[PDB]
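Subject: Protein entry, chain in single-letter code together with its fold tokens

Area: Proteins and the way their chains fold up in space.

Attached in line: The record itself begins immediately under this heading.
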Amino acid sequence: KTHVQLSLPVLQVRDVLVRGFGDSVEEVLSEARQHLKDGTCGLVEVEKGVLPQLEQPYVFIKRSDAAPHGHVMVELVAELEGIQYGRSGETLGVLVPHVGEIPVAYRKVLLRK
């Protein structure tokens, strides 16, 4: 399937134990996709002060369309030193590995895979 229904645990930035997916744009997009497939991917909502507490490159989920079955359609955009790889809509948040942190919410998305 080109799209997969996912329920992503929303994590508080200060709870996150592993603050990025790796060291290159290509690696972080790779690792993000692997963690999404394996159900080991969390979502941090972006506000003032959040991104400097996480490791670059960043992987964002961005709204790709204006929401089947409650699931917002999203795609992955990476960012490294202010350059984005991908073009998409509004940020739903930044993806991080999930290693058992307790979430504050869940975000239903339809991921373009």
Q: What stands out?
A: The beta strands are 3-10, 41-44, 58-63, 72-80, 83-85, 91-97, 105-112. The longest helix spans residues 25-38. The chain has one domain: 3-112. The CA atoms of residues 21 and 27 lie 7 Å apart.
